Unconditional design. Sequence first.
Length: 490
Amino acid sequence: KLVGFRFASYISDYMVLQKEPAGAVIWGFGIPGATVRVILYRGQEAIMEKVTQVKAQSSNTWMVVLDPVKPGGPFEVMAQQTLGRMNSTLRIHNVLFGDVWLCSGQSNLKMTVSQIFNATKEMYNIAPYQSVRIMSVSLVEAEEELEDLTEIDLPWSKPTPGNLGHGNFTYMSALCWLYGRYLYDTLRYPVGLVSSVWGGTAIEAWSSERVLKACNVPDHGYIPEESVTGPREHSVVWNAMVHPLCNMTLKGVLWYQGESNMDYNRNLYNCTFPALIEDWRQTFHRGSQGQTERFFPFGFVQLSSYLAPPSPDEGFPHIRWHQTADFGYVPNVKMPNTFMAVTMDLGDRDSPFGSVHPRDKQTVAYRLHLGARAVVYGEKNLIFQGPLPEKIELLARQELINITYHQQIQLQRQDNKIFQISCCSNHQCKWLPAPMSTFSTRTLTLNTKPCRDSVAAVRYAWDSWPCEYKQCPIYHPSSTLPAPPFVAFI
Ligand SMILES: *[C@@H]1O[C@H](CO)[C@@H](O[C@@H]2O[C@H](CO)[C@@H](O[C@@H]3O[C@H](CO[C@H]4O[C@H](CO)[C@@H](O)[C@H](O)[C@@H]4O)[C@@H](O)[C@H](O[C@H]4O[C@H](CO)[C@@H](O)[C@H](O)[C@@H]4O)[C@@H]3O)[C@H](O)[C@H]2NC(C)=O)[C@H](O)[C@H]1NC(C)=O
Ligand SMILES: *[C@@H]1O[C@H](CO)[C@@H](O[C@@H]2O[C@H](CO)[C@@H](O[C@@H]3O[C@H](CO[C@H]4O[C@H](CO)[C@@H](O)[C@H](O)[C@@H]4O)[C@@H](O)[C@H](O[C@H]4O[C@H](CO)[C@@H](O)[C@H](O)[C@@H]4O)[C@@H]3O)[C@H](O)[C@H]2NC(C)=O)[C@H](O)[C@H]1NC(C)=O
Ligand SMILES: *[C@@H]1O[C@H](CO)[C@@H](O[C@@H]2O[C@H](CO)[C@@H](O[C@@H]3O[C@H](CO[C@H]4O[C@H](CO)[C@@H](O)[C@H](O)[C@@H]4O)[C@@H](O)[C@H](O[C@H]4O[C@H](CO)[C@@H](O)[C@H](O)[C@@H]4O)[C@@H]3O)[C@H](O)[C@H]2NC(C)=O)[C@H](O)[C@H]1NC(C)=O
Ligand SMILES: *[C@@H]1O[C@H](CO[C@@H]2O[C@@H](C)[C@@H](O)[C@@H](O)[C@@H]2O)[C@@H](O[C@@H]2O[C@H](CO)[C@@H](O[C@@H]3O[C@H](CO)[C@@H](O)[C@H](O)[C@@H]3O)[C@H](O)[C@H]2NC(C)=O)[C@H](O)[C@H]1NC(C)=O
Ligand SMILES: *[C@@H]1O[C@H](CO)[C@@H](O[C@@H]2O[C@H](CO)[C@@H](O)[C@H](O)[C@H]2NC(C)=O)[C@H](O)[C@H]1NC(C)=O
Ligand SMILES: *[C@@H]1O[C@H](CO)[C@@H](O)[C@H](O)[C@H]1NC(C)=O
């Protein structure tokens, strides 16, 4: 109905488009049946040209896929609209080509540069990162999937101190920006960061109907008040803030979510999250006409610490577990081409926003940058996963449990209460603290004395607030990566 020739909403000046091998997609609206010519200029020279015609059927859209472009810039992109004796031209300037990353999640990734530690110096450190272009999607929800973005908080723009730290939970994600900054330090070519994030949302709002069907999520349509403070309805956030973007070619996705699922559909998270990334991969693949990799990188953050009221069953450790598909590490078979950052040891007790919103986002960006370099940018043989036990065995006569880790381990502190084992007597189990007894470069021996001989399972770091800041027991000496939490059965 709106027949005004225009680019898509997220196509503006200063943007970053996807680089070779993938081809950037340029689409917009116009008059049905009119002809559209999209020309890419390097300076004043027209490097390339594609031709298409605006759909005469329902969509009312015109779309071209450019040829692979080499990272760099600046470029210009022009679209010309012609029909009969009617002529129109659109031009966007200072376009760059490089790796585009989509950041989404809830309030912890909404947190801005102005809100984190060392805020001012990070805010004003942009001089070497002017080719790290940024955009923040405004909060909109919709009952049905949308073809275009309704509302944009921060259009494509070069980073400045003001737009980096532009308020409380507003413009630029500290995590997204810092991660893109590490990425630019490494890659040294243009990076684009599009952040569409809504605080206090459950993963159901971010998933389409397909994931809900695949995981048999209860079709309440609504979600317990306190658990989630944002849009309850299913898939609305996805419909209005992520679906329109799936026609943009992007390098990868950064994801920080799970806090709102601690007490809502907890036990289905190990289904929904892998299903979510898979559905996003497929939908972006078809939306960009195959330009986005069908298995594009999906880097995510494991939930951080949280000072929580005492509870018999805490959701946070369960969600930390389910975020790995109950496997303890990524990438794994259920999540190929994915990297993770463990953040439970980066707890902030005195944060003004809450224990759940720690201000140390630089360390998170560093660990995510390790994961990305290893999994995505061919920096193999770089330690990006924390020490995880390859072998667990039980010595019933010695009343011990011998655990051996794949990587060498280094002891930062002993915690009698961090290791817990389950005591199933009369076939009724009970979780009890198991103190560490012996330690070695690659193995440690736990003690069973409090549980007699009915041992069934062990678990490590299964508390919402497991340790104090950067003070967890087990660490890698070289990589400064913490031993991730886990549960194992005997
Ligand atoms: C509070 O926040 C500020 C702002 O971010 C931090 O200060 C920056 O910290 C980063 C990271 O330490 C510094 O970046 C490093 O700079 C070194 C040289 O930078 C100078 O020289 C280059 C030209 O060579 C100039 O372009 C640049 O502007 C600087 O003048 C690099 O050598 C570093 O890279 C390598 O270092 C290690 C090895 O030691 C490698 O392992 C790395 O992978 C990497 O390859 C790095 O790029 C930056 O210079 C700091 N200053 C500013 C103004 O940003 C504070 O650290 C932070 N403080 C606290 C307490 O949180
Ligand atoms: C994604 O993650 C979720 C949560 O981790 C998984 O859902 C649970 O998975 C576990 C393990 O597969 C299931 O546990 C089974 O529970 C049975 C009884 O359940 C009752 O008791 C528990 C607690 O006591 C209550 O919470 C529950 O509501 C019921 O009242 C046990 O009988 C099972 O054990 C039997 O078989 C095993 C097989 O080896 C023996 O070792 C045991 O001794 C015993 O004979 C088992 O413990 C649990 O039922 C699942 N649901 C819930 C709500 O907890 C998903 O499976 C997981 N999905 C994927 C794909 O990873
Ligand atoms: C960017 O890439 C994405 C990739 O998905 C594309 O998104 C697709 O957009 C179209 C919109 O045209 C979506 O298709 C629409 O689905 C409607 C509802 O489907 C459900 O409900 C119907 C009955 O209610 C069932 O039959 C069906 O099986 C589903 O269960 C259809 O009703 C739509 O057709 C009707 O809508 C238009 C209104 O615009 C009418 O004018 C038509 O005449 C027709 O009656 C339509 O098919 C599609 O679902 C989206 N993809 C996905 C995966 O969901 C974008 O199109 C693409 N953008 C560009 C510019 O290329
Ligand atoms: C960004 O947010 C911080 C944190 O505040 C908390 O989180 C926000 C998301 C909101 O939900 C806030 O309602 C919430 O408290 C803000 O810090 C707060 O700053 C204000 C003003 O500087 C402080 O208010 C005053 O505090 C003095 C104490 O000396 C009282 O006497 C006054 O009457 C008045 O209440 C407030 O204490 C402070 N809160 C915390 C927890 O530190 C911050 O202002 C905000 N910044 C911007 C730019 O919006
Ligand atoms: C716990 O398991 C580890 C792992 O095997 C044992 O350490 C091994 O000890 C043998 C002794 O001959 C060495 O040859 C291996 O090289 C050791 N492995 C490693 C990784 O160091 C350890 O002895 C076991 N401890 C107990 C009490 O059973
Ligand atoms: C549209 O106008 C521009 C500038 O006047 C011109 O270069 C172009 O050839 C025109 N296209 C038509 C008339 O189809």
